[PDB]
Amino acid sequence: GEDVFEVEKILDMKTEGGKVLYKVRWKGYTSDDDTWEPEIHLEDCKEVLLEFRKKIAENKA
């Protein structure tokens, strides 16, 4: 009941009136299934966050 779905990775982020959302790729699903999630859903996904921060840093320089 606890692991029905898994985040593969954060694809991108946004704010909407200052509040953070993440666009999520669900492991085992296609890009048609991607969703926007509020930050509080991902805030504790440490590895997922590290990987997204790395992708930000890499696209910076």
Numbering used by the authors: 0 to 60
The authors write:
MPP8 contains a chromodomain in its N-terminus, which is used to bind the methylated H3K9.
To unveil the molecular architecture of the chromodomain of hMPP8, hMPP8 chromodomain (55–116 residues) was recombinantly expressed and crystallized. In the free form, the hMPP8 chromodomain consists of a twisted anti-parallel β-sheet formed by three β-strands (named β2–β4), and α helix (named αA) located at the C-terminal end packing against one edge of the β-sheet next to β2. The dimer interface has a buried surface area of about 1025 Å2, which is strong enough to form a stable dimer. Sequence alignment result indicates that hMPP8 chromodomain is more similar to HP1 choromodomain and lacks the residues in dPlycomb chromodomain for dimerization. The size of hMPP8 chromodomain in solution is corresponding to dimer, consistent with the observation in crystal structure. Therefore, the chromodomain exists as a homodimer in solution and the homodimer structure in crystal is not due to crystal packing.
